[PDB]
Symmetry: none
Subunit: 260 residues, 2 copies
């Protein structure tokens, strides 16, 4: 690896120098993923279509901004394709370790709620909201672009994505689900971000097959994923040949779900 | 045959050196090779002493204090890798200084705004009502340092009565800085200050009156150069150094490693 990847008047940067510079900082993290990818692809099938179906989901939402968001996260489409594939493999290994018995699903059903869609207005302090609180004296969407410091939603009347329980900020959501009918509005909520006002747009047999999807969703925790990978790692009988990389799997060799 | 050696063996097959190289390069190759390349070009032209790097290392280490190690790990750094980045950053600083106008007219003009370092204490709180409460306790005879330990959400300084390190102009939030230098005498306390972080009260500990330019010029020069080490100027300097280096990229995977500088 004495070959030059870059030449300068001051000398060359070689393959060797680039390899070792990268390895020192990123070697453990990358070799871990390469290792898991191999052992998992051996046991679990991911089809090119499965990767495509996942890919398109993301591709639709972002529209014009798709390619732009990849670059901002240091991704190409193909490198993104690879990451979706890796995530699916881990997802499969985690699901293989899930107990999806009727009793668990029936038990999960009582706590579960469907997704909720709202608008909101974000401001720095309660008095400004109080100005907004009295502001009706008129349209919620109009005052959102007028006052909301949430640049992601301000232009769009403060419209939020659909979201479920546990999945968004606790205080915000309590207030959201308390909403009753189309377009009626909350009191002032104080979150980590600031003070909010929230407006409802959409709320909704067991209708359970959705819950099955939701339960599996909720079980894709970092703990369960780590637990699943520990089992796979153990069954693979790995031997680390490069002693620089001996600590590459530290996050998977403790009684906890992480290193330190 | 090159890099065919296994770095890891598994029942499912081996991952080789080459595969690790190529995988790292895809994600981290551009950023790492950019730094290696600039370091080599800059090392050739500009002198950095170990004395400088150590002084910089100590600066940051004390500055972050207890939270030092935690912030390194969060940025995927060791002490060793961090020290290397400081050396690299200093090289970039040298190239930027070489691009600076440090003429007497610039310095004398900078002198007008410049001040010697100032030492203050402060109390940081979430809202104005809390600050007003503290202002009333101060009037009623409670101690500023006591109220810092009781109220201040600035964990870095709250235990020590809210004492901050000495700082000059430009180094802090502008609003904070104006309010601090506006204080006249030792133990004077500010009105409510509103920064990006929250609401402050500030107490003066030490202030020094600016001397003549002749007496202060070496201080003024150091501060001026420092104020010119902006992200804009450093970027400009690296563009200029890169163009002058006439580099030749051999690995087409890395063709865009310097996109921000061409």
């Amino acid at each position: 690896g004495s070959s030059a990847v870059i030449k300068t008047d001051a000398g060359s940067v070689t393959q060797d120098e680039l390899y070792e510079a990268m390895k020192t900082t990123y070697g453990n993290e990358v070799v871990q993923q390469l290792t898991f990818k191999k052992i998992l692809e051996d046991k679990y099938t991911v089809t090119e279509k499965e990767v495509n179906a996942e890919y398109k989901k993301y591709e639709e939402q972002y529209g014009d901004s798709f390619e732009s968001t990849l670059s901002s996260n240091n991704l190409t489409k193909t490198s993104f394709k690879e990451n979706l594939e890796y995530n699916l493999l881990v997802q499969k290994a985690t699901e293989a370790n899930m107990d999806v018995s009727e009793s668990k699903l029936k038990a999960y059903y009582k706590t579960w709620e469907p997704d909720i869609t709202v608008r909101h207005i974000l401001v720095d302090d309660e008095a400004t909201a109080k100005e907004i609180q009295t502001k009706l004296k008129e349209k919620f969407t109009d005052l959102a672009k007028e006052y909301s410091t949430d640049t992601a939603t301000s232009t769009n009347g403060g419209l939020l994505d659909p979201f479920g329980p546990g999945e968004m900020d606790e205080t915000f959501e309590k207030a959201a689900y308390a909403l009753e009918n189309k377009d009626d509005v909350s009191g002032i909520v104080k979150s980590t971000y600031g003070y909010h006002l929230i407006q409802l747009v959409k709320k909704t047999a067991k209708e359970k097959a959705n819950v099955k999807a939701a339960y599996i969703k909720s079980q894709l925790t970092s703990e369960n994923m780590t637990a699943a990978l520990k089992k796979e790692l153990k069954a693979a009988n790995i031997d680390i040949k490069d002693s620089d990389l001996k600590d590459a799997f530290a996050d998977y060799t403790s009684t906890s779900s992480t290193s330190s």
